[PDB]
Amino acid sequence: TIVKPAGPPRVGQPSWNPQRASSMPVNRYRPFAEEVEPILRNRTWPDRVIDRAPLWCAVDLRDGNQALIDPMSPARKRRMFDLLVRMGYKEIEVGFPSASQTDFDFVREIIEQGAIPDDVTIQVLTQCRPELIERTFQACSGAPRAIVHFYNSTSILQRRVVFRANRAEVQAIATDGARKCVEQAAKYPGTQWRFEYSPESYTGTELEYAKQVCDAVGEVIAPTPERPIIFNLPATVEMTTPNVYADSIEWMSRNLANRESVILSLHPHNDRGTAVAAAELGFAAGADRIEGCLFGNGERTGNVCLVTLGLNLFSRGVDPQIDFSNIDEIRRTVEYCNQLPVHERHPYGGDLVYTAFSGSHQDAINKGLDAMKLDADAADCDVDDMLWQVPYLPIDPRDVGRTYEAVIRVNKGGVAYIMKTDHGLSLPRRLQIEFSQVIQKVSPKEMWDAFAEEYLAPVRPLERIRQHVDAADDDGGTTSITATVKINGVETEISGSGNGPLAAFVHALADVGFDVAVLDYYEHAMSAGDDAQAAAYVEASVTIASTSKTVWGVGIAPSITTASLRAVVSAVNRAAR
Amino acid sequence: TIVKPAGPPRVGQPSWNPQRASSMPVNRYRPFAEEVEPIRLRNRTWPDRVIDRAPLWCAVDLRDGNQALIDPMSPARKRRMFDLLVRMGYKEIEVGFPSASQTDFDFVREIIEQGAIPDDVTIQVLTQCRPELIERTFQACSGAPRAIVHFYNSTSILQRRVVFRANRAEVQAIATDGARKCVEQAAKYPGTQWRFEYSPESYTGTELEYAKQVCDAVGEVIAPTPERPIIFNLPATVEMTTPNVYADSIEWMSRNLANRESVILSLHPHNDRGTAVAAAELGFAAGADRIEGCLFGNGERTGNVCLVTLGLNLFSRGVDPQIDFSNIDEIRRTVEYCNQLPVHERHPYGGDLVYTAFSGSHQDAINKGLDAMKLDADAADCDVDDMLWQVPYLPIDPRDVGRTYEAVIKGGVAYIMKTDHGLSLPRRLQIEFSQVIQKIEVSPKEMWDAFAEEYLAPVRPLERIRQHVDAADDDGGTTSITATVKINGVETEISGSGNGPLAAFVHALADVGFDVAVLDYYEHAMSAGDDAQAAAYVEASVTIATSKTVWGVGIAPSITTASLRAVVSAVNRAA
Numbered sequence A: 001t002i003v004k005p006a007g008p009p010r011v012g013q014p015s016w017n018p019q020r021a022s023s024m025p026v027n028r029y030r031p032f033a034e035e036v037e038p039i040l041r042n043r044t045w046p047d048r049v050i051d052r053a054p055l056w057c058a059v060d061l062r063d064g065n066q067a068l069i070d071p072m073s074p075a076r077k078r079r080m081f082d083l084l085v086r087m088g089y090k091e092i093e094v095g096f097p098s099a100s101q102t103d104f105d106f107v108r109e110i111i112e113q114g115a116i117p118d119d120v121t122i123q124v125l126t127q128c129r130p131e132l133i134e135r136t137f138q139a140c141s142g143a144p145r146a147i148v149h150f151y152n153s154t155s156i157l158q159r160r161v162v163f164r165a166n167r168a169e170v171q172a173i174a175t176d177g178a179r180k181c182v183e184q185a186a187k188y189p190g191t192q193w194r195f196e197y198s199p200e201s202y203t204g205t206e207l208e209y210a211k212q213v214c215d216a217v218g219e220v221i222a223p224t225p226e227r228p229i230i231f232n233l234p235a236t237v238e239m240t241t242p243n244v245y246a247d248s249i250e251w252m253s254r255n256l257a258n259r260e261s262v263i264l265s266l267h268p269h270n271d272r273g274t275a276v277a278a279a280e281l282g283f284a285a286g287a288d289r290i291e292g293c294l295f296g297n298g299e300r301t302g303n304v305c306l307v308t309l310g311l312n313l314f315s316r317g318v319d320p321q322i323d324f325s326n327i328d329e330i331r332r333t334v335e336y337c338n339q340l341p342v343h344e345r346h347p348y349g350g351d352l353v354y355t356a357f358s359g360s361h362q363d364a365i366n367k368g369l370d371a372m373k374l375d376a377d378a379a380d381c382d383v384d385d386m387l388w389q390v391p392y393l394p395i396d397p398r399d400v401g402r403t404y405e406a407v408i409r410v411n412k413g414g415v416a417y418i419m420k421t422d423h424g425l426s427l428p429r430r431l432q433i434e435f436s437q438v439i440q441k442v443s444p445k446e447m448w449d450a451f452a453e454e455y456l457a458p459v460r461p462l463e464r465i466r467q468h469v470d471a472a473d474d475d476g477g478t479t480s481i482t483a484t485v486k487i488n489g490v491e492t493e494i495s496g497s498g499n500g501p502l503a504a505f506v507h508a509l510a511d512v513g514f515d516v517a518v519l520d521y522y523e524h525a526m527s528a529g530d531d532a533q534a535a536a537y538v539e540a541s542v543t544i545a546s547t548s549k550t551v552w553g554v555g556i557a558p559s560i561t562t563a564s565l566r567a568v569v570s571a572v573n574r575a576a577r
Numbered sequence B: 001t002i003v004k005p006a007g008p009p010r011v012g013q014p015s016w017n018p019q020r021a022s023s024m025p026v027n028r029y030r031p032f033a034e035e036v037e038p039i040r041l042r043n044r045t046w047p048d049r050v051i052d053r054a055p056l057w058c059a060v061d062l063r064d065g066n067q068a069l070i071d072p073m074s075p076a077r078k079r080r081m082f083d084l085l086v087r088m089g090y091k092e093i094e095v096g097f098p099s100a101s102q103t104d105f106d107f108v109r110e111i112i113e114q115g116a117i118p119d120d121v122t123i124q125v126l127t128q129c130r131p132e133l134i135e136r137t138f139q140a141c142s143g144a145p146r147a148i149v150h151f152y153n154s155t156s157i158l159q160r161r162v163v164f165r166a167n168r169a170e171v172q173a174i175a176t177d178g179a180r181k182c183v184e185q186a187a188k189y190p191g192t193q194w195r196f197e198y199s200p201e202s203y204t205g206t207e208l209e210y211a212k213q214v215c216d217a218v219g220e221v222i223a224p225t226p227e228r229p230i231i232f233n234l235p236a237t238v239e240m241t242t243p244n245v246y247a248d249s250i251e252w253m254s255r256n257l258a259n260r261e262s263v264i265l266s267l268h269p270h271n272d273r274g275t276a277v278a279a280a281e282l283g284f285a286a287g288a289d290r291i292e293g294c295l296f297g298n299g300e301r302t303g304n305v306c307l308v309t310l311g312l313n314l315f316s317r318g319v320d321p322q323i324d325f326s327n328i329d330e331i332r333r334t335v336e337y338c339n340q341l342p343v344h345e346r347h348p349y350g351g352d353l354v355y356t357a358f359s360g361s362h363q364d365a366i367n368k369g370l371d372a373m374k375l376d377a378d379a380a381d382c383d384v385d386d387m388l389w390q391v392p393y394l395p396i397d398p399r400d401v402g403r404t405y406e407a408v409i410k411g412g413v414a415y416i417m418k419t420d421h422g423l424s425l426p427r428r429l430q431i432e433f434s435q436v437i438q439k440i441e442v443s444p445k446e447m448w449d450a451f452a453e454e455y456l457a458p459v460r461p462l463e464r465i466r467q468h469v470d471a472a473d474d475d476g477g478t479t480s481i482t483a484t485v486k487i488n489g490v491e492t493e494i495s496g497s498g499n500g501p502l503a504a505f506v507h508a509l510a511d512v513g514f515d516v517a518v519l520d521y522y523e524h525a526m527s528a529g530d531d532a533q534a535a536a537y538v539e540a541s542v543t544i545a546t547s548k549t550v551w552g553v554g555i556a557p558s559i560t561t562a563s564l565r566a567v568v569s570a571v572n573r574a575a
């Protein structure tokens, strides 16, 4: 159970701090400087602001995949690979094919099926045993180019307790691997081979030893500015604060031999919740490249989140060179592949991150939005192309395909739930959002009364009295409609044709100055039985004669056909409100 | 939808980087130094400091966390969170915004009237600067033995312009008038040890010189002393840049604020760029005294800084957080109950997966580390559980937080059908169909072939050739249908009436021995546009001349005809 800390305060603890010593076994843990080494008074990274995208490398198919409760099926691997290509990643670690037969099979498939674009380089992980390196080259046979990423653990702790080995011995593991790579590359001249070396558990390794091993590997590989080597420096375990990782990167960047022939790569994990920070400060410290995963998947606490890194650049005016314009599509694909949810509060992608619940936040957002519109109007400009200036929202949610949501509480609650339970309507999410904004400007009765005044009651400018639907009998035929409607109270007769009743009615309305451009449509039964009422919902960008507004309409009727027509009328009248 | 970046690479972009420019509208966003101001601090010292003591913690779960929930805390859940925070060792706890929320008001009353506050705990209440709101705040706190009144107003460049439409002098006056009102009210309420906190809200969007001015001026009104200090709390209301810049701003504030001996400098970072924990740790190294956050990072949007990560980050580097985390599962269970939001599988220290190793190589290394520890423990007559933790891949002994190390040794139907085929299957259909799939990994193309074979292709026993729908012109009138169908290859006419075309068609089928009792029905567009195809789904209990529960699926350019196809598909599924 939880025991309130009751030990004495620290000597010198201020009297305004009444905290007490816990009984947690702090004696079993040491500061980083004592655990590993003291690490740079003339650092420059604190004075550098990132002004370009790094070279990204996506490791979802390897570090991500091996961290899953359910590793990816062949379909899932391919869907993830295709997503990363489409987003614009050019280096993608496709697996560990020498250690994993399913990974071997996957690398063969993408090579043999021509799934790899000419500007994409696949990367494959291997440990250093020579038979594993041979299997690695074999997996990539026929690729036009590939990165062979080999590694071994170099940390003080692993050298002692895992290897029981001296510095020379652990270095030879790496340099023997490098020699084997050079030998294998010569055997496969139809592939442009490139190399990446990681001193694994780098953050548990003396910098001078990490440098010595990388330098020695480079001597074997013999890279040049035209054919560089990647030295990848992982926080295999995140051990300390990100400024210390950044100092370590700046030291490596300054001190590694033949720096002009090196692409310096970062591989941070998230044990202390600071991976994103480690990557950003590390990149400012001189790194060239960052490995991570979409939405921070990967071993234990995960690899650094590539989404957060990329949009942290976008939102400060730096092009990440990756497309995040539909973050929900990225999220849904990632959740399908990984079978792990993106958290409600995850930066940029989480369900709740574009929501405002506080009245004062909602008011300030509205004011920001209004002021942007006023400035756009004066500059004869599209508000969506102008400087984003809205309190509480770091980005326009529309720039990643999301929507600002002003959430209104119902005093189990919530608009969606009450509407379904009390009134039998399942509102599409975008309707819930639009309606809540209306409510914003509540008891169940107030919410219902507001819903009916908005969507169900209006009879101006458009009322639909009755209609004759002439549907062709054969599949693929035309449906035509003549409708009796009142336009601002004036009875008239409209006619249109289309591929169904909704299309026909939309076309009939166009002739009388309601342009209804349909964006979406949903319908459901409000109970069981073939004689149930149907509730229909239509989303439309609507322009009325004598600018366009995207709005929803709702229609309810015993005929599935008529319910959809009522939803169109509802939408038109909502656009006039 | 996702379009591969195709724009020209940047001038000077290295040849070994073949990334192309995205079409994201980056011109709508400016660097932080242009949006707000450049870094004012000279000779920073935070990069050279390693934290060696716990800060003063303040938990804001009951205010910032609570107001951010879709299902806000009931009175029972509030008390449970309050009790947890007390039992963990928190000494400052923000219990609500009582002048804005009657439920918060009642909760503050409850804990004061019940004598629920330990002698070493100070409750904290948030208020805006308006004098009636300040009055109602002191009303809520009436009878508290001690209380922090935390008043604030927005000071950012942006909010001054578009929210308040006010200048610097006017916005400073709002703060300084709120402070005067606080002093007046405190003098009217005896006995209570009143203490104050002021936040320049949206501090990260505010010029530092100006934030310093407003704070100084508020401090002049309150007149704090080293024995009765004021808290200046500097929020990253929105996390706007990298955590080193936030830390630079805190160092500058700590070095430049007046009456520094009478100031507790407090941080309140939110997580919009994923760096709240870093902002707090570097900020603390920069001279702050105090950190506001929530357990497991609840709070507006991306949340407040995680108190659990911050506390255990100290513990795992040998610094006592002065908070008990010895049973993180209990903490997590209680937080999940109170917030009704899960702790993510990968959340530092508390997530489901954070002490699991799936790699055979990692598991080997972990065992070797545990063995060397056990060896040393024997060679020293010590319990291993009290020795220095020395285990690859595991930053802490999971047992130290009441957890265990775990050496551990699916159709995608909804996603595939929606993504590749534009069908949003009803949940019960997803279930029914994934059962067909399980029986048959089946690839996406095989899944589609099976779906078509089941719901779309069958033409026996029932085939619908064509039909005439005679729809009611008037709302509430009868709709009739007559259709030409084939019943096991035999062409026949069916006809029926009902309150709509679906009811008419099922009445028509009943005459020929196909009894379709409809249980549910859904339809949606398969793309944008008024000419889009509709997909319809009908659930029914079908009896062919017994109550077989089935789904049918229909696709057509007519909303009406798609529904008729779905009825036919259900009948054929039933046979």
Ligand SMILES: CC(C)CC(=O)C(=O)O
Binding pocket: A063, A125, A150, A151, A198, A200, A201, A232, A234, A235, A236, A237, A267, A269
């Ligand atoms: C080769 C390394 C990058 C292995 C790894 O994932 C790590 O060290 O974190």
Ligand SMILES: CC(C)CC(=O)C(=O)O
Binding pocket: B064, B151, B152, B199, B201, B202, B233, B235, B236, B237, B238, B268, B270
């Ligand atoms: C008074 C402030 C600390 C309000 C707040 O929650 C914030 O600025 O983040």
Ligand SMILES: CC(C)C[C@H](N)C(=O)O
Binding pocket: A498, A499, A500, A501, A502, A503, A504, A518, A520, A521, B524, B525, B526, B529, B530, B531, B532, B533, B534, B557, B558, B559, B560
């Ligand atoms: C699917 C719908 C948006 C409309 C359909 N094309 C009809 O006219 O009935």
Ligand SMILES: CC(C)C[C@H](N)C(=O)O
Binding pocket: A524, A525, A526, A529, A530, A531, A532, A533, A534, A558, A559, A560, A561, B498, B499, B500, B501, B502, B503, B504, B518, B520, B521
């Ligand atoms: C709501 C639906 C199940 C059917 C509706 N009664 C119709 O006949 O069109």
Ligand SMILES: [Zn+2]
Binding pocket: A063, A234, A236, A267, A269, A298, A299, A303
């Ligand atoms: Zn890794």
Ligand SMILES: [Zn+2]
Binding pocket: B064, B235, B237, B268, B270, B299, B300, B304
């Ligand atoms: Zn906050």
